[PDB]
Design a protein around this ligand. Structure first.
Ligand SMILES: *[C@@H]1O[C@H](CO)[C@@H](O[C@@H]2O[C@H](CO)[C@@H](O[C@@H]3O[C@H](CO[C@H]4O[C@H](CO[C@H]5O[C@H](CO)[C@@H](O)[C@H](O)[C@@H]5O[C@H]5O[C@H](CO)[C@@H](O)[C@H](O)[C@@H]5O)[C@@H](O)[C@H](O[C@H]5O[C@H](CO)[C@@H](O)[C@H](O)[C@@H]5O)[C@@H]4O)[C@@H](O)[C@H](O[C@H]4O[C@H](CO)[C@@H](O)[C@H](O)[C@@H]4O[C@@H]4O[C@H](CO)[C@@H](O)[C@H](O)[C@@H]4O[C@@H]4O[C@H](CO)[C@@H](O)[C@H](O)[C@@H]4O)[C@@H]3O)[C@H](O)[C@H]2NC(C)=O)[C@H](O)[C@H]1NC(C)=O
Ligand SMILES: *[C@@H]1O[C@H](CO)[C@@H](O[C@@H]2O[C@H](CO)[C@@H](O[C@@H]3O[C@H](CO[C@H]4O[C@H](CO)[C@@H](O)[C@H](O[C@H]5O[C@H](CO)[C@@H](O)[C@H](O)[C@@H]5O)[C@@H]4O)[C@@H](O)[C@H](O[C@H]4O[C@H](CO)[C@@H](O)[C@H](O)[C@@H]4O)[C@@H]3O)[C@H](O)[C@H]2NC(C)=O)[C@H](O)[C@H]1NC(C)=O
Ligand SMILES: CCCCCCCC(=O)OC[C@H](COP(=O)(O)O[C@@H]1[C@H](O)[C@H](O)[C@@H](OP(=O)(O)O)[C@H](OP(=O)(O)O)[C@H]1O)OC(=O)CCCCCCC
Ligand SMILES: *[C@@H]1O[C@H](CO)[C@@H](O)[C@H](O)[C@H]1NC(C)=O
Lengths: 330, 330, 120, 343, 333, 334
């Protein structure tokens, strides 16, 4: 029964030719179900995503008259019929799944409509701008199009349930939080021709709790600790010198963690600016004591510690106000 | 209907084993590339990874068809039934063609017999790098395209479009590098057996110095300056000058070891090793100066004259060292 | 003290010569045999590396057999069809084979040597 | 002779594109899993490896046969011409079907027409984790599988035995270094997607992390460093260089411990229980040196009391801090541990 | 001559059915196995597995492949293996394995006139090895390799080591980076079940870890730091800056050693012998500094309301630390 | 045109690829040569190296003699898969790649007399066992052994096309080494025995010497300077007890940091190298300078310069210089 229908459909069917070739463009409706968005690898400027990608089109050559409404098949007939050559333009590496069988679904209606769904894991490319790290926001895209068919032959179009997501907590985002999703469509002109490119943008915002606990607070505490020397008597030379240089060593140790999970970008991030300024503050505190010791002993000025007790906390609070306003709000 | 007849007629009797114009003039194969991205520039492995759209154009009279004004885009599996050039990359270590959702390959035919053959390839090409000037180094990485088993009596290569054959270079963003320029070379590798066609695509990468300024040079300079504070400390403060000198030596060692752990492992002397060693020598001599002062005063011209001389010589010698370093490597 | 004690040999008109290695395990070293004619030179005879690959000289190809006992850390040489030309001093060598495994300068540990005299 | 004939006649008029009982009934597949080894759990990748013998049994009336033989073992080439369930793991990332030295698959056919399909797989599956209680955290790593193209109206899945006994783990099949395999819970349900309703079979393995390593490596060194910082309160106020070096070197020691402690933990952007513990220890060490700055601000005589003029009395700030600091730290530890060990 | 060999091979392959084992209805076919080990590498404690490359040969007799009139053993092209019956041999604890295919698939098929078939493969396999590292680095490991038939019981197939104890060669030529193979064993046994007995072969090693690097980089520096912390006991009690700086810098040095060995050594999240020794030395330098704090409090705090405690510590600390070393090295050795 | 097709179809009529040429009649002799385009990176941690080669094999098959207008036939790789070829494999190969981008990088040529040439482009990753006892002053001979997998010495023998020294050719820009110096290569052939018989093995050894300047600047010089710094404290007056104590302990911490970093630059092996012993000796010297100060301070009751300090200002630099001379003469003369 069904075998006869399948044999009739496959008889006189050339899969080298797209449906309605030479007549009208093949309209394709695409849907995506994001199973999980994997980790964002900022070092390699990429991210992982696992999706169920669905495509629906019309092939008049597959019409069959029978009591059966729809033929529900496995991946066996995939290589037998024509399939769009959809590929992901910003994918560094993509793989389908084959365990235990090719994770594909094919459904053919009696009017010729074909539904083709498959599961994919895609390592898409995302160019991260890290000037505001760790207060950075990103919109990582995901673009796909036909590799060989221009806009005059294959046209893609989002279905009503274009992009669907499940439990965002089940996703593998350690450093980012999913905060939105958009989808676009446009025409990109290349050497081979003009192609219809559909894009999906996933908005991600980094969480600053770990960077607050690990870097910002210990650095602030060390800067305050370096201000202790101003209240130590100037005669205690070994005490103020050892405190100043050990605070410099501790700040140098903390400056190691500043560039740990991010690539070697050659622009000053917010974290680097904060660490460098804290290092300059403890450097100037030790230079201040070296100057006071030289002028008082080795050679207004005598009251330098009195003004340093006010200027250093004030300059640091002004810096923090400017930093957290230029970054948190502006 | 009519297209199916024309395509079947074209593929009927086609001999894949024979190149176009088998006994006549060499087939002229034009090539153009669209660089999608470049990444994973590895100084350790001396290679780089690029993803590109590699398109070849050639004419085959056996595939000419008449009566159809359209350019026939066929399924990529028809490429297995046609003759294609044996183009390979000489310096490629590991390359693949992406195969999601289908194999990223295109075949487009034209009524005059012109064949366009496109591939989406991610290849890792070996690049010999000279890093004696690292991080102030300029690299020249190439991509060699050649025919494996055909001489110039059978095949010829040219860049289709001249200097505009390669596109997309200006949009490449490398976190650590900047593409100064790229060049296209079309030459014949003349041998005793015969000349072999070759195309060369080369990029000149310039490393960005901002990262090392923020992470390496400024910390070393500030620690070296801090080591000079002991020259203004009274010579009687033994516990303060000794503590300052040996703590600055420890801080320089900590910076050096951290950089040895975070920078790529390049086991030969680079400009960053010379600079770090020079700063280590300067802080070593700064501590030795106080050791000499202490021995002269206690163990045995004038005690204060050595310090006064060093307060000038050390900043002067360090500035001369920086001037020599920055002029020699720039 | 690392030593290469050589046994066997003597006056021979089939001869087996051993070479015991002590003080160092030569599992990953190339163990070879060398022959030194009186006053002429030191001649390479046979060798065997870690992978049991056997190398032989042209003059002794197919005549002499080299075998290594990796468990006992020793190397044996089987001499057959001996000729008066083979009357010379036999040494046992072990080295990394740097700059050729046939050159004598590539071997560092040398046995005290064994004298084999062939009379016909 | 007869064996070959039966094998040749079995696939006569058989269409592997159609499931058994198409348009007549619902294909019932009975499955059971033998976990030879529960492989390592990757906290950084939030995935776990597992090696199993997956067994599936169903009935296909198109494969009935008669003969002296009772059970037919099929060649893999012949087994690839017969319809098999399209079972896939919903949370699987990259599973490996072993092919050494031959494909590790076995197909047995009974004369009744029942098929038994057994394969050996290495399954890497996603195990979402919430490490807010790290290292005192417990997780339930799931393993969900079902049909891909067939809805519950066509193919359903059942466990061969009771769900507790349908998943069997070997006695020494535990490859966990940091976790303990408390047990497994086996169930099944229905998942509704955009294409239909699918039967899903789930197994949850319960893991509990071992806290001993973090106690020896992180908690004890931090506690002892804090105690060392509070020890300086018993030094005489006149020894300014000693108490200053003590304070800042303990701050540097805490910085070293915090850095190495965050190196072991995978890079998450939220604060774990250990991050809070280290932050509090950092605050205590900072406050000990601020306390000494306050004590030093009210010290008059540089010289200290000798064995036999006037001398500085013991600071009331020091006397109070010798009690307040250890008491506050003890209370914090009591709260922190009763908070997370009672989870 | 050659055409005769061609027709003999055609006759042997004419009517041969790869779906039937030799002596299908009769006694089980005895399969003799031997392994030539090329190298062992990447013995990973984190992944609890090791990777080995071996030449795996299998001999069995198939009377259907018996030929006469040719006194030579017919070594055929490796693709003829796809046209014959081979045992369904798999490695039970294998996690990831492959057969080398450069320049061709590294397999061999040699036929003998009596019908004996030699089937050789060059296989690199990563086999699981569960390791007990409580005694690390003074530990021994026992890593095995299980060989089993996937779908045949002992009624259909049987396994044995061809050559007995000499079946496996190349063991003594292996040189591991941080291990030393002591001995290896061959086990042939049947896994008895209700359905039936299944043949199994087991090749096992005994790995002994080298200790030189741990002695030079872990134990000796910690011992030297601990001895340096005792120097405070020979400094005058009134040298507060010297004794406090020495005590807290030795504490900082011990912390640096612990944290850097934590990063350098493989991530093994449970208590090992190295961790116990490092923690013991950290405690000893902690108590050495606390001793000075107690001395200073006795002399200065409870003064108005001290060489004895130092004299006592100059003996107790070296004695207690030596006793701790004696117990440690007797426990783990 | 049609003549080429006729010859191609006629070639494989009656051919049996399962049988080597001259089976039962003679020994199939294969002449091989290698052109190394790049001697890739050498991995100390994995004890392996990568090499990119053009592998050329030539042999005679009388079954493929043809007569026609052309003298050389170039075969498609599909047709090349229907013809018997040697099953050459690399004995120490670990994971090799036969490139097929964008087409299979293979080439089969047949002369009129039946001589076949088989050239392929390969990337071979081969294991190079290393003795790191003299690290970083060690030299190695990384081998490359290849031969037949299934055919014994009595069936297939390999030979070099030219004199063995000239048969393996390395490109002028071939070397891609950062840590080693490719001094040269030696080419030889031998015989191995397995449980399956005697086989002919063709071996090539590439001789590498590690560059030492990096370890001199990163490790040896800072360790020497740190030891000199520790011995510098002997010139301070004995009454500066806190100063010499801080000097001693901070030099010990500096040496510990240097030792850890120097070990992080060495592959994870459990035996002792030469740099391990150099660092251990420097550690002993820095430890002794502080025990020496503890001994000086134990007798400090104006005070005179301690006779212990006077003797140590001579003994410590002398003992360290003697150690340096012994160490370098021990390792730089091998
Ligand atoms: C340069 O060289 C490299 C190699 O060094 C080369 O890459 C190779 O490229 C070829 C294609 O050119 C690849 O081969 C294809 O693989 C497809 C699936 O790939 C997955 O599986 C591979 C292993 O195959 C097993 O699994 C598949 C399903 O996953 C299964 O179909 C197979 O039969 C087989 O499993 C069965 O049998 C084995 C025993 O043989 C059992 O052990 C097993 O249990 C099971 O029973 C695997 O190797 C792949 O991984 C590699 O590649 C991926 C790519 O992304 C990469 O990520 C990995 O890292 C890894 O490198 C991957 O997991 C397979 O579908 C193809 O076969 C198709 O198409 C061919 C076309 O000629 C056709 O002949 C076949 O009949 C078959 O037709 C399909 O079958 C589908 C179902 O399988 C069906 O849905 C389709 O509709 C269609 O038609 C059906 O066919 C069936 C069967 O005949 C029939 O019953 C139906 O009625 C219907 O007609 C093909 O084999 C090869 O894997 C690549 N290798 C590597 C190492 O990359 C590269 O291309 C070269 N470049 C150039 C320029 O030349
Ligand atoms: C990275 O590093 C690589 C390698 O150094 C750089 O690649 C080199 O780029 C330069 C500049 O583009 C190339 O020089 C050009 O070469 C072409 C091709 O020459 C070949 O083909 C010619 C065909 O007619 C042939 O005549 C040439 O032979 C002559 O020259 C050679 C010497 O090169 C000599 O030995 C022969 O006897 C002949 O005399 C050769 O086979 C050439 O056409 C270019 O000529 C231009 O400039 C000359 C200047 O006098 C001018 O007269 C011409 O009219 C024309 O304008 C030019 O010489 C060089 O070949 C490349 N090398 C390689 C190996 O490819 C690459 O540029 C670097 N990257 C970056 C970003 O810089
Ligand atoms: C964060 C705390 C901020 C506290 C801010 C307020 C700090 C504050 O009030 O300090 C003063 C005193 C300092 O303690 P201490 O005893 O060291 O100070 C004595 C005090 O200054 C006397 O006035 C001096 O005598 P006088 O001048 O000659 O008559 C006496 O001189 P001497 O004869 O002994 O040499 C000094 O020693 O401390 C408190 O009262 C404890 C307050 C609560 C401390 C709570 C600590 C947790
Ligand atoms: C984006 O998706 C929505 C459905 O979520 C759809 O209505 C809208 O048309 C899409 N936008 C474009 C530009 O395709």
């Amino acid at each position: 029964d069904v075998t006869v229908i399948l044999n009739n459909l496959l008889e006189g069917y050339d899969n080298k030719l797209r449906p309605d070739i030479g007549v009208k463009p093949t309209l394709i409706h695409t849907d995506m179900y994001v199973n999980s968005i994997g980790p964002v690898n900022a070092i390699n400027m990429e991210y992982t995503i696992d999706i169920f990608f669905a495509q629906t089109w019309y092939d008049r050559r597959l019409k069959f008259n029978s009591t059966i409404k729809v033929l529900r098949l496995n991946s066996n007939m995939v290589g037998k019929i024509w399939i769009p050559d959809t590929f992901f333009r910003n994918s560094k590496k993509a793989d389908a799944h084959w365990i235990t069988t090719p994770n594909r679904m094919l459904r053919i209606w009696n009017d010729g409509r074909v539904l083709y769904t498959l599961r994919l894991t895609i390592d898409a490319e995302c160019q991260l701008q890290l000037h505001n790290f760790p207060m950075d926001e990103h919109s990582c895209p995901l673009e796909f199009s036909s590799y060989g068919y221009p806009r005059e032959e294959i046209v893609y179009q989002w279905k009503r349930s274009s992009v669907e997501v499940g439990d965002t907590r089940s996703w593998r985002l350690y450093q980012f939080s999913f905060v939105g999703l958009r989808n676009t469509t446009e025409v990109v002109k290349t050497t081979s021709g003009d192609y219809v490119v559909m894009s999906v943008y996933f908005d991600l915002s980094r969480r600053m709790g770990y960077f607050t606990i690990q870097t910002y607070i210990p650095c602030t505490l060390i800067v305050v600790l370096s201000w202790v020397s101003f209240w130590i008597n100037k005669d205690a030379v070994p005490a103020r010198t050892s405190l100043g240089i050990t605070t410099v060593l501790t700040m140098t140790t903390l400056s190691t963690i500043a560039r740990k999970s991010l690539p070697k970008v050659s622009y000053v991030t917010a974290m680097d600016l904060f660490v460098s300024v804290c290092f300059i503050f403890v450097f100037s505190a030790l230079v201040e004591y070296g100057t006071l010791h030289y002028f008082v002993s080795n050679r207004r000025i005598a009251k330098m510690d009195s003004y340093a007790r006010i200027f250093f906390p004030t300059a640091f609070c002004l810096f923090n106000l400017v930093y957290w306003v230029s970054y948190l709000y502006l | 209907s009519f297209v199916k007849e024309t395509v079947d007629k074209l593929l009927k009797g086609y001999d894949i084993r024979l190149r176009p114009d088998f006994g006549g003039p060499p087939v002229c194969v034009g090539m153009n590339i669209d660089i999608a991205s470049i990444d994973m520039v590895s100084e350790v492995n001396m290679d780089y990874t690029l993803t590109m759209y590699f398109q070849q154009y050639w004419r085959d009279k056996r595939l000419a068809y008449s009566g159809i004004p359209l350019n026939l885009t066929l399924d990529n599996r028809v490429a297995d039934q046609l003759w294609v050039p044996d183009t390979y990359f000489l310096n490629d270590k590991k390359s693949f063609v992406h195969g999601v959702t289908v194999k990223n390959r295109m075949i487009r035919l034209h009524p005059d017999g012109t064949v366009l053959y496109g591939l989406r390839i991610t290849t890792t090409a070996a690049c010999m790098m000279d890093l004696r000037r690292y991080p102030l180094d300029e690299q020249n990485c190439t991509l060699e395209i050649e025919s494996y088993g055909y001489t110039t009596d059978d095949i010829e290569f040219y860049w289709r479009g001249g200097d505009k054959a390669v596109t997309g270079v200006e949009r490449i963003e490398l976190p650590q590098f900047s593409i100064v320029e790229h060049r296209l070379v079309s030459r014949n590798v003349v041998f005793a057996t015969g000349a072999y066609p070759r195309l060369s695509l080369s990029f000149r990468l310039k490393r960005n110095i901002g990262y090392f300024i923020l992470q390496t040079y400024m910390p070393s300079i500030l620690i070296t300056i801090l080591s000079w504070v002991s020259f203004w400390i009274n010579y009687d403060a033994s516990a303060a000058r000794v503590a300052l000198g040996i703590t600055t030596v420890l801080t320089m060692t900590t910076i050096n070891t951290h950089l040895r752990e975070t920078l790529p492992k390049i086991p030969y002397v680079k400009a960053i090793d010379m600079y770090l060693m020079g700063c280590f020598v300067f802080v070593f001599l700064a501590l030795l100066e106080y050791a000499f002062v202490n021995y002269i005063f206690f163990g045995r011209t004038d005690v204060n004259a050595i310090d006064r001389w060093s307060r000038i010589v050390f900043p002067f010698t360090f500035s001369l060292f920086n001037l020599v370093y920055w002029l020699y490597y720039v | 003290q690392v030593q290469l004690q050589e046994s066997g040999g003597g006056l021979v008109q089939s001869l087996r010569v051993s070479c015991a290695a002590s003080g160092r395990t030569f599992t990953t070293y190339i163990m070879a045999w060398f022959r030194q004619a009186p006053g002429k030179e030191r001649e390479f005879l046979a060798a065997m590396d870690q992978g049991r690959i056997q190398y032989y000289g042209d003059s002794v190809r197919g005549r002499f057999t080299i075998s290594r006992d990796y468990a006992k850390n020793s190397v044996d040489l089987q001499l057959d069809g001996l000729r008066p030309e083979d009357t010379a001093v036999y040494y046992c060598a072990a080295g990394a084979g740097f700059w050729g495994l046939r050159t004598a300068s590539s071997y560092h540990y040398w046995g005290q040597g064994t004298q084999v005299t062939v009379s016909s | 002779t007869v064996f070959t004939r039966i094998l040749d006649r079995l696939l006569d008029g058989y269409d592997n594109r159609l499931r058994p009982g198409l348009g007549e009934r619902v294909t019932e597949v009975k499955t059971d899993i033998f976990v030879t080894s529960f492989g390592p759990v990757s906290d950084h990748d939030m995935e776990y490896t597992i090696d199993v013998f997956f067994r599936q049994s169903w009935k296909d009336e198109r494969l009935k046969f008669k003969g002296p033989m009772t059970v037919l073992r099929l060649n893999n080439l012949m087994a690839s011409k017969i319809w098999t369930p399209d079972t896939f793991f919903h949370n699987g990332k990259k599973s490996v079907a072993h092919n050494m030295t031959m494909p590790n698959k076995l197909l047995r056919i009974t004369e009744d027409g029942t098929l038994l399909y057994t394969m050996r797989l290495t399954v890497r599956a996603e195990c979402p984790m919430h490490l807010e209680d790290f290292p005192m955290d417990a997780h339930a790593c799931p393993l969900k599988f079902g049909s891909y193209a067939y809805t519950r109206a066509e193919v359903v899945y059942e466990w061969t035995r009771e769900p507790a006994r349908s998943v069997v783990v070997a006695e020494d099949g535990s490859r966990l270094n940091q976790y303990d395999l408390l047990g497994q819970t086996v169930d099944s349900g229905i998942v509704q997607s955009s294409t239909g309703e699918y039967v899903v079979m789930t197994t949850h393995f319960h893991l509990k992390r071992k806290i001993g390593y973090f106690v020896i490596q992180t908690y004890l060194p931090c506690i002892m460093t804090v105690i060392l910082s509070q020890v300086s309160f018993w030094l005489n106020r006149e020894s300014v260089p000693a108490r200053t070096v003590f304070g800042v070197t303990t701050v540097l020691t805490m910085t070293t411990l915090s850095i190495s402690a965050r190196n072991s933990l995978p890079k998450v952007a939220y604060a774990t229980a250990m991050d809070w513990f280290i932050a509090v220890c950092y605050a205590f060490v900072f406050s000990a040196l601020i306390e000494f700055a306050t004590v030093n601000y009210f010290t008059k005589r540089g010289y200290a009391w000798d064995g036999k003029k006037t001398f500085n009395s013991v600071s009331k700030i020091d006397r109070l801090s010798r009690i307040a600091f250890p008491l506050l730290f003890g209370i914090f530890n009591l709260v922190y541990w009763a908070t997370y060990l009672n989870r």
